[PDB]
Structure formats: structure tokens, C-alpha cells
């Protein structure tokens with residue numbers, strides 16, 4: 001047997017599906033999602049960290065001269081200064097008054113710990129939902145991992161389920177993101193090979209073990225001060241260290257729908273958007289013959305109490321005449337009210353009680369026993385507690401029922417006005433028809 | 438200096454860019470695509486290969502009875518046959534004539550070489566262009582591997598180049614593709630966990646080294662013949678081997694625009710579609726002060742022989758009056774004719790001859806030397822060879838030039854008709870004004 | 875800090891984040907006199923309730939005015955021929971119903 005329903009994508013909501021198949025007694029299947037994941041696909045653009053300036057011992061040539069030599073290093077600089085007199089220590093280090101030159105060179109490398117402390121610039125494309133659902137019906141109770149697309153098919157006690165694609169294409173991530181230790185930033189990083197000094201990505205590398213090392217750090221050598229051996233230079237400080245202060249607020253702190261942005265596999269756990277279409281193919285043995293189920297006649301529904309709070313703040317009672325002791329499956333055919341139970345024990349003493357949840361002042365819904373249908377109307381009252389530590393057990397349907405307290409007044413007033421209008425119309429029409437001829 | 442052009446995505450087409458910076462002599466920069474790759478991003482769905490049926494030795498209990506226990510193996514069958522008399526060999530193997538049960542058992546395993554040959558089912562998303570361009574100007578001769586998106590920036594001899602996103606989002610791959618050894622199929626494989634017997638996907642597995650093994654091979658276990666030990670069964674043959682026979686024509690055989698679908702990293706190399714925007718940042722050392730540039734006076738262009746073939750079928754000579762020797766830079770300001778040379782040689786008293794390529798009977802285009810200019814017109818005869826082994830060195834611009842042979846006839850005829858029409862207009866106006874008196 | 879019906883979350887120190895929600899509490903009586911019901915719904919949804927009440931009041935006044943105008947026109951049509959006749963002997967019974975001087 002083939003059946004298709006739509007369940008909301010909210011974690012913890014107890015969803016219940018009713019299957020009515022000719023020849024058998026109705027089946028109620030309860031099935032709720034226990035967690036959700038949403039992983040984008042990531043293309044690594046480059047890797048950035050803090051740099052390390054390499055500065056070797058200067059070359060001094062007493063009574064001589066030198067020549068600058070280009071090299072393959074990143075941000076490499078080299079200069080030769082014309083007349084020096086170093087005075088190394090306990091002496092002058094040259095016997096040569098004015099014909100001495102110093103060779104000063106420096107270049108930029110990667111930090112010795114860049115494989116531990118670095119950030120990664122990514123590009124995020126279409127993500128894939130991946131849920132975890134608990135299915136309960138009859139006497140099976142099992143939770144399974146699925147992919148929320150039309151592809152993955154799972155089996156639970158002989159029934160096949162396909163949890164169709166999410167109705168929403170929303171995603172918390174942008175095109176470009178930056179991922180540090182445990183947090184994610186919707187950031188717009190520089191192009192590769194065009195980084196700038198003192199800002200994020202002033203040195204770049206395609207991977208951790210890559211060997212390119214673009215570097216733009218504004219390194220610059222300076223002439224040594226007269227009488228001492230040293231190699232002065234100036235250089236803009238690290239842009240990774242600047243970013244580690246001025247980065248801003250992470251996606252972790254500000255994510256819509258209560259997404260929980262998580263670790264190494266970049267994912268958004270437990271967002272609350274959209275609906276999940278699901279189609280099931282139940283075996284023939286999962287149902288009960290009508291001749292083997294109790295017969296319910298003269299079903300009547302009366303509501304004991306009614307408080308439209310977040311939890312199950314209503315109680316209703318059903319009175320009936322039965323023929324034998326058995327189990328019946330209960331269902332609410334409107335989403336104004338959410339039953340807590342999926343089945344009930346039916347006994348000769350025709351009384352059964354169920355708890356439901358609603359958010360309306362005057363709910364009105366049809367409840368069903370195994371082979372019975374009845375209408376339940378109520379008058380709920382608002383709660384007194386302002387704040388609660390849990391989420392609502394209902395779909396937030398507020399509009400009052402027709403023939404409730406609030407809408408009965410509208411009906412009566414509209415009836416009075418309409419009666420007056422039709423009386424006026426009849427008077428005018430009769431007068432005009434009589435006076436015409 | 439910043440300059441931006443648009444080059445076509447055609448491998449081997451010689452493209453030439455013109456840069457005209459005030460205060461400097463114009464510079465012609467030529468750059469051509471050498472290679473092209475277009476790689477999608479793939480999400481592996483599952484793995485399929487040939488299966489293996491495992492049939493252990495049957496268990497025969499003489500003078501007793503057996504009972505069968507279900508296991509968790511894929512496609513597992515177990516059956517008990519009540520009255521047997523096996524007759525093992527040189528004997529009967531049992532004493533009781535009718536109280537003897539055989540326990541038959543079989544299941545399905547993944548092949549021994551499933552890691553050495555199998556088919557992967559993927560899902561293909563947005564692809565990334567990645568070209569290999571050779572740039573030439575002045576004395577530089579380099580080819581760079583670059584990513585064709587607005588991001589990657591690269592420097593060739595001091596000039597920074599950025600090759601922008603392609604103008605079209607065409608891809609040769611579908612949403613679902615199957616990858617066998619070296620060939621790619623645009624095929625719509627079954628969902629995971631819903632494969633059918635005898636067809637591609639009768640056994641599935643998420644990864645080569647995974648341990649799930651969904652199997653649906655229609656295994657079925659039969660009753661042994663009297664007096665003989667054997668496990669008879671029937672089963673549908675492998676769907677992977679069936680697919681290898683009836684898999685169709687690969688994407689390699691049919692693929693638009695001359696794509697060459699290639700190996701392990703699934704890519705579509707050397708397709709010819711779209712344009713590539715380019716942006717460069719030239720230094721001052723690239724140009725030449727307009728003082729050094731020879732001054733060209735009285736430039737005239739005349740075409741000796743022209744045929745509009747695929748190669749450089751045209752020849753033109755420029756006559757000029759100069760003041761000094763040097764190297765100018767030529768350019769064609771209309772894509773109706775494509776020049777072969779970038780730089781010329783201006784001599785003290787002489788001409789310069791250049792070859793061009795066209796597809797039009799009567800092309801008209803403007804050719805420039807260092808800073809002078811001229812207009813060229815020609816009459817071109819069609820080629821003789823029907824078929825050539827190389828692609829056109831031009832853009833297929835066939836519309837002729839106004840004042841050409843074919844259009845001047847229309848000019849004269851329409852002018853005569855217009856003269857007749859305006860004469861008639863004047864005659865009618867004169868008549869209707871003279872009679873107005 | 876605001877706690878809508880959608881929910882709210884706060885994180886304080888090295889403790890785990892805490893989530894709170896808001897119930898549909900209000901002032902007034904859902905089943906009372908019409909002003910009490912109006913006050914209840916204004917407690918839940920102020921702007922929507924104001925808009926709905928104003929719209930319904932405008933519609934009711936429009937209906938009343940249209941009906942009264944139609945009776946006025948009908949009385950005019952029934953009584954005006956007698957105002958043209960020189961004799962002008964209006965029946966007293968029809969004067970009673972239509973308030974004829």
C-alpha cells in the first residue's frame with residue numbers, strides 16, 4: 001500500500017499520520033525527527049596564517065664591494081650600502097677606513113606552527129540535508145539515518161520510506177566563508193595572489209603542504225646605523241593577527257532559525273525551515289482486518305478542560321458502545337488540535353480520555369476512534385505563565401472557529417444588518433413595481 | 438595602467454589586443470589559449486559491481502530434524518526439507534529411511550575484485566573553468582596556468598592578469614552521471630536501497646571499502662533431487678554484466694562543441710564556447726615614449742591578392758614616409774580581417790607587407806602603424822579546396838562592405854528608384870499647389 | 875531582552891546556551907462581553923485587531939446608511955405623486971406609515 005504525507009521540519013514535534021485503507025482498520029503512524037544536519041560542499045581557495053621574517057647574518061666586506069643577487073623567496077629584499085665601519089667588538093673589524101660595504105637581505109616565510117594555527121577560505125555551494133527520524137507504529141520503534149532527497153530509501157519492519165526533498169532552498173552560509181578553529185564567518189576574502197599588507201590574507205597558500213607562499217607584507221630594509229653590526233628594517237605587522245581581533249561576530253552567534261553551526265564537517269545542525277515530503281509503502285501484514293477490530297457506535301465527544309498553552313493543556317473524553325475489547329487508533333483531522341496518543345484501549349465500559357494541545361480560544365476538530373467519527377468543540381482559556389523553557393506542541397493556528405463565542409457575535413450582528421437590508425430592498429422593490437404600473 | 442578586453446574561448450586562436458596609452462607609442466599584446474579544462478564537483482552516491490553467491494556445504498541430520506535461523510547477510514535464504522535419503526558415496530550416509538532433514542542456505546557477497554573494477558554513481562554540480570594561456574609582448578614568452586574566475590590573479594613579467602568568469606554556464610554533464618573506467622555516461626541510476634534484479638544497481642554499496650551491501654538479486658532456494666547431495670537454487674544474473682552489454686553510447690562519443698571527456702578527475706577538456714574577459718595592470722616599463730617611436734607620415738594601404746580561405750589568404754602592403762628606423766606595432770580595428778603579425782619593421786625608405794585572414798568577398802578595415810592610420814579595401818575570390826585539416830584563422834564575418842561590388846549595385850538601383858519616387862512626389866505636390874490657386 | 879513566540883537563546887560565560895519561549899498570555903476574556911473579547915485579541919495581536927475592528931465598523935455604518943437611504947427613496951417615490959396633484963387628498967392610513975404632513 002502506497003501512502004504520502006508531509007511532515008514539518010522541526011526537531012521534536014510529534015507528527016502522526018493516519019492511513020485509511022479499505023478492508024482494514026485505520027492505522028496511525030507516529031514519526032518525528034530527532035536531529036538534522038545541513039552540509040555545504042566546500043572548495044578550498046587558500047590557507048592563511050601568520051608569517052615569519054627570516055633575517056640572516058649580514059655580509060661585510062672589508063676593503064671591497066658586493067652585488068645584489070635576486071632570489072626565488074617570497075617578498076625577498078636585498079641591498080648594499082656603500083661606506084661602513086662596523087666596530088664589531090673590541091675592535092673595528094675592518095682595517096679599512098671608507099671602502100667597506102654591507103650586504104643586507106631578508107625575506108618572508110611561513111610560521112613554524114601554520115599547520116596547527118591557520119584559517120581556511122572556502123566557497124560554499126548547494127548543501128545536502130541529512131536527518132535522523134524515529135518511526136513508531138504497531139509494535140516497532142526504531143530510529144534511522146536518512147538523506148533528505150528523493151534518493152535514499154530505508155526499511156523499518158518491512159515498510160519502505162523515502163523522505164523527499166526539503167521544500168525550502170534556504171541556507172545560512174554565503175558564497176565565501178572563512179573557517180577558523182570552531183567558528184564560521186560569512187566573509188569576503190581577497191582574491192588569490194592579490195592580498196594586501198596588514199589585512200587578512202597578506203600571505204596566502206593553496207594548501208597546508210603547498211609550496212607557493214604568496215606574500216605581500218611591505219617589507220623594507222634600512223641603512224645600518226654608523227658604528228654597529230645590525231640589519232634594520234620595517235614591515236607591516238601580521239594580518240592574521242589583525243583579523244584575530246577585528247574579525248567580527250561569527251555565524252555561530254547570529255544564525256536564523258536557531259541553526260547550530262558546527263565543527264570540522266561544516267554543517268548547520270537543527271535549523272527549522274520547510275517541510276519534509278515522505279512516501280511510504282506499507283506491507284499487507286501491518287494492518288488489521290475490520291472483522292478483527294472492535295466496532296464503535298454512538299461515539300460522542302465532550303471536552304473536560306481546555307487551556308491553550310504550549311504543552312498538552314486540554315482533556316477530552318469519548319463515550320461509545322462497543323462489542324469487544326480491543327485497540328483503536330485515534331486521530332485529529334484538523335491541525336488546530338494535536339493529540340498526544342496514537343492508540344487507545346477500548347473496553348465495554350465505554351469511556352476513554354485523551355490529551356490534546358491547541359493555541360486557539362475556541363478549537364473545533366473531528367476526532368476518530370477505530371471506526372468512529374465525532375466532533376469536539378471547546379472553549380480554552382489563556383495561560384498565566386509568560387515564559388516557558390520548551391517549544392509549543394502544536395501548530396500555531398489561532399483563528400477562532402465559526403460558531404465560537406467571538407464569531408457568533410459577528411454572525412448575529414451580520415444577520416441583523418442583512419435582515420434590515422433585505423427588508424429595505426423588498427420595500428423599495430414592491431413600491432417601485434406597484435407605482436410603475 | 439589598467440586595460441580590459443574580451444577574448445574568445447577558442448583553443449589555438451591567435452588573439453591580439455591593442456593598447457593606446459597617451460604619451461606612449463601603442464603596444465600590441467597577443468595572447469592565446471593553449472588548453473582548457475572544465476571540472477564538475479561530484480558527490481558519490483554508491484558503488485556497484487558483480488556479485489558473488491556463497492553456498493556452504495548442506496547440513497544433513499540423520500534420524501532427526503533441523504530448524505532454520507535467520508541471519509543478517511544480504512539476500513539471505515534458508516530452508517529445511519523434511520524427507521531425504523542423500524546417498525553420499527559408496528553408501529547411503531543415513532540409516533533412517535524417511536526421518537532425515539537437509540538444511541539449505543545461501544547468500545550474496547560483493548565481488549572479490551570490486552575494488553579493481555566497478556561503476557561509480559555520482560551527482561555533478563557547478564563546474565570550474567581552468568585554462569592555460571600563453572602571453573606574449575615585447576620580450577616576454579610565458580604560459581601560465583590560471584583559474585578562469587574573477588578571483589585568481591597572476592603576474593607575467595611585471596604585468597598582473599586576471600581572467601574573468603566565462604560568459605556562459607553550459608556544461609556537458611547531466612545531474613546524474615555514471616563513471617566506468619575511462620568513459621562517462623549521462624545515466625539516471627536507481628536510488629540507494631531500491632535497486633532491481635538483473636539491472637544496473639542490483640547490489641549497492643556506499644563506498645568501495647564500506648560494509649553495507651544492499652542486495653536484490655532474486656535469490657531463491659529449491660528442493661534437492663532424490664538421493665543426491667547438492668544445494669539447488671535459481672537467481673537472476675548480474676546486472677553489472679548486463680549493463681556492460683547494454684549501456685549505450687558514452688559521453689565521449691557524443692559531446693557538443695568538441696569536448697574531450699577525460700579520465701579520473703572527471704573533466705571536459707578543450708570545449709569551444711563562450712568568451713573570457715581579461716583585465717591587466719601594465720607597468721610603465723612595458724611601453725615606449727612616443728619620442729623614440731618613429732613618426733609615420735602619409736600611410737596608404739593597398740591589397741595585392743586576396744582569397745577568403747581558412748588560413749592567411751590575404752596580402753597587403755603599406756607605403757609610408759618615415760623619419761627614422763624602428764619597430765612599430767600593427768593592428769586591425771575590425772574583426773572582419775585578422776592580422777598575422779603583431780610588430781612590424783619600419784625602414785628608412787620602404788614599405789611593409791602583412792598577411793591577413795578573412796571570410797568576406799569584400800572586406801573593409803582600418804590598419805594602423807605606430808600612430809598613423811589607413812583604410813583597406815579588397816576584392817577576394819573564394820578558395821578552391823573543399824576540405825582542410827585546420828580551423829579558421831578568422832571570425833566568420835561574411836557581410837560585405839558598403840561600396841563593395843555586391844552592395845554598390847543595390848546602392849545604384851535603390852538610388853534610381855528613390856530619384857523616380859522623389860520626382861513623382863515633387864510633381865504631385867506642384868500640381869496640387871498650382872491647382873490650389 | 876525580547877522573547878517572542880519564535881523563541882530566544884542566551885549564552886552567559888562558559889555555560890551551555892539556554893533557550894526560552896513565550897506563551898500566548900494576554901489580558902481580557904476570550905468568552906465575555908464584546909469589549910472583553912476585543913481586549914483579549916488586542917493583547918495578542920494589536921495592529922491586526924485594530925484594523926479588523928475599524929474595517930467592520932466602517933462596513934456596518936455603510937450598510938446602515940445605505941438601508942436608511944433606500945427607505946428614504948422608497949418613501950419619496952410612494953408619497954411624491956400626491957404632492958403634484960392639485961387636490962392632494964392623501965389617505966390618512968398611508969400618511970401614518972410614511973409620515974405624510
Ligand SMILES: *[C@@H]1O[C@H](CO)[C@@H](O)[C@H](O)[C@H]1NC(C)=O
Nearest residue numbers: 062063064094095096097099
Ligand atoms: C691589508 O690591509 C691593506 C690596507 O691596510 C688592504 O689594502 C689589504 O687588502 C689587507 N689585506 C688583507 C688580506 O686583509
Ligand SMILES: *[C@@H]1O[C@H](CO)[C@@H](O)[C@H](O)[C@H]1NC(C)=O
Nearest residue numbers: 134135136137140141142143
Ligand atoms: C522507543 O525506544 C526508545 C529507545 O530508548 C525509547 O526512549 C522510547 O521511549 C520508545 N518509545 C516508546 C513509545 O516506547
Ligand SMILES: *[C@@H]1O[C@H](CO)[C@@H](O)[C@H](O)[C@H]1NC(C)=O
Nearest residue numbers: 571572573576577578579580
Ligand atoms: C616563444 O614564442 C614563440 C613565438 O614568437 C613561440 O613559437 C615559441 O614556442 C615560444 N617559446 C617556447 C619555449 O614555447
